[PDB]
């Protein structure tokens, strides 16, 4: 695979978002991957609705947490609307997908990257943005100011984000905490340390959308 990958340079990543006080990261993570595969498959970069997934994924728990995989399954089943037609409110409301009109985009499936495998993850990142998880509760992660992050951090994952690239010594991650955190909202997390959990448990659970 290439030595460096950065989907932002390929026009496949929209502006950094802020999930606020709601535990909706799983939806934000899913959305980044949908925005990415759609740009990759159709040539167009669009913004999709995290709120829609927040309100409509009955397997997830609204602002109390959720799953990137069920959100992605939802998009494969019913499609997703544009973010501007279904804007973020930071609180879960009732599902109003059918109140909007035809979906904006639809995927064909969901695949999981073999876990605890750094090479498999990079391989998939080379193909498209991937939803990944990590432990972000630690103070160091919270205060991240830039550079290639090594922690310290455990592997009890608690946050979903999106890997949109990588390099010889890091994996490039788009976080959902606004542009005032990290490197204008992104984090470069150290890779290649021989830790199969991945730094902060980064290799624990990665999924990506399939689009014929």
């Amino acid at each position: 695979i290439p030595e460096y990958v950065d989907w932002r340079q390929k026009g496949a990543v929209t502006p950094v978002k802020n999930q606020g006080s709601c535990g909706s990261c799983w939806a934000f993570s899913a959305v980044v991957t949908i925005e990415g595969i759609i740009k990759i498959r159709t040539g167009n970069l669009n913004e999709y609705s995290e709120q829609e997934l927040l309100d409509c994924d009955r397997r997830s728990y609204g602002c109390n947490g959720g799953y990137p995989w069920s959100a992605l399954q939802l998009v494969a089943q019913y499609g997703i609307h544009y973010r501007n037609t279904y804007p973020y409110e930071g609180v879960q409301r009732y599902c109003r997908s059918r109140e909007k009109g035809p979906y904006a985009a639809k995927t064909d499936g969901v695949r999981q990257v073999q876990p605890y495998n750094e090479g498999a993850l990079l391989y998939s990142i080379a193909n498209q943005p991937v939803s990944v998880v990590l432990e972000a509760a630690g103070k160091d992660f919270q205060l991240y100011r830039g550079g290639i992050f090594v922690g310290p951090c455990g592997n009890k994952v608690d946050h979903a984000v999106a890997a949109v690239g990588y390099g010889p010594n890091y994996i490039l991650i788009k976080n959902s905490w606004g542009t005032g955190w990290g490197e204008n909202g992104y984090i470069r997390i150290k890779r290649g340390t021989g830790n199969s959990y991945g730094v902060c448990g980064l290799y624990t659970s990665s999924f990506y959308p399939v689009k014929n």
């Binding site: 802020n18 999930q19 606020g20 006080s21 709601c22 535990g23 909706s24 990261c25 799983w26 993570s29 997830s60 728990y61 602002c63 109390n64 947490g65 959720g66 799953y67 990137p68 998880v133 972000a136 509760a137 103070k139 919270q142 205060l143 991240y144 100011r145 009890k156 994952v157 608690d158 946050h159 979903a160 959902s176 905490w177 606004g178 005032g180 955190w181 990290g182």
Partner: protein, 84 residues
């Protein structure tokens, strides 16, 4: 495990104390922070601490649930919710 979910310290103790002082300030209340009975944290944009705290209200012990929203990088700390 739920990503962004609620899961079960010196800093946490001060956040609990912070919640009670913040509540007293906003409501002109006189709650006396007695102790942190239980604590859970949730990753959001930053961290949402779900603190179960015992206070003294009019000489009587009472337990409240406080949600304190911390965004460390912004030096921000907010009392998000407070109720029995």
């Amino acid at each position: 495990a739920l990503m962004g979910g609620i899961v079960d310290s010196a800093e946490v103790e001060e956040l609990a104390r912070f919640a009670v002082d913040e509540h007293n300030k906003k409501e002109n209340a006189l709650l006396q922070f007695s102790r942190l009975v239980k604590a859970k944290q949730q990753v959001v944009s930053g961290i949402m601490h779900h603190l179960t705290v015992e206070v003294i209200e009019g000489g009587k012990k009472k337990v409240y649930e406080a949600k304190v929203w911390v965004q460390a990088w912004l030096n921000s700390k907010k009392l998000h919710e407070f109720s029995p």
